[PDB]
Write a protein that binds this ligand. Structure first.
Ligand code: CA
Ligand code: CA
Length: 266
């Protein structure tokens, strides 16, 4: 079970939005302990669905990760994007921020009066995180609480904390990144994760540190692979395996390197 929506296609995944109209709930920084944000939830749906937190992690970023909110929610997820300039900073504080954001969603889910009351299945939680938020994502993945992880241009001080990650993890690396150079961050972080774990490494060709944030030159890749990652691992929706295990990913112009442990869900 957990499957939702029609048989997927590339065009279905690369469209500017998914099928479901999306409504929003603004969360003040006064509540939650995670810096405020916006809950994106689909309309017209039935049943429960997975929840995803999307967290930034670049102090004085020029832009953020908001694209993921409406994009992912429109394929059947409750997706909260966290605001920037929250007082959190380094990867350990960002793990706390993620945990507080997840608590908040579950708390509102358990409320009878939330606009998305009862929409979330608490057993199916994912996190997408950028920069030091990506280091925080990998740290929460290592804590064992989540069911899928997408670090975006992750930054952290060490890879040793990630040597036991069992959470399905897709790292988007940005080839030309000078903030979190791939060779010192996304690459060794990916290689630290055991080869028994369902994982993938997608380096985006010529990408700056912002390349994974979406609403940019990489929409096709981030949507096609990122939505598929969450459908496959949070919904156990085998219909999305085709986009992740099978294609010659590096043949794509936008993808300068691919690594992975296909097949998944063995
Ligand atoms: Ca290049
Ligand atoms: Ca495998």
């Amino acid at each position: 079970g957990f499957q939702r929506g029609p048989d997927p296609t590339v065009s279905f995944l690369e469209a500017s939005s998914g099928p479901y109209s999306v409504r929003t709930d603004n969360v003040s920084s006064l509540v939650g302990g995670f810096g405020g944000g916006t809950v994106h939830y689909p309309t017209g749906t039935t049943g429960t669905m997975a929840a995803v937190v999307v967290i930034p992690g670049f102090v004085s970023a020029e832009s953020s990760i908001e694209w993921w909110g409406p994009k992912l929610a429109s394929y059947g997820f409750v997706v909260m994007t966290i605001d920037t300039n929250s007082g959190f900073d380094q990867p350990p504080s960002r793990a706390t921020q993620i945990n507080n954001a997840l608590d908040y969603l579950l708390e509102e889910n358990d409320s009878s009066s939330s606009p998305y009351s009862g929409m979330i299945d608490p057993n199916r939680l994912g996190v997408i995180g950028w920069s030091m938020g990506g280091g925080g994502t990998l740290r929460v993945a290592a804590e064992g609480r989540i069911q899928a992880a997408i670090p975006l241009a992750p930054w952290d001080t060490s890879s040793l904390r990630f040597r036991n990650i069992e959470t399905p993890t897709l790292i988007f690396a940005c080839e030309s990144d000078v903030i979190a150079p791939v060779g010192s961050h996304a690459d060794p972080f990916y290689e630290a994760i055991p080869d028994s774990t369902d994982k993938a490494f997608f380096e985006l060709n010529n990408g700056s540190h912002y390349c994974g944030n979406g609403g940019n030159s990489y929409n096709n890749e981030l949507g096609r692979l990122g939505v598929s990652w969450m459908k496959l691992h949070l919904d156990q929706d085998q219909r999305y395996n085709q986009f992740l295990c099978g294609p010659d990913h590096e043949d794509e112009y936008r993808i300068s390197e691919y690594r992975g442990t296909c097949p998944y869900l063995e």
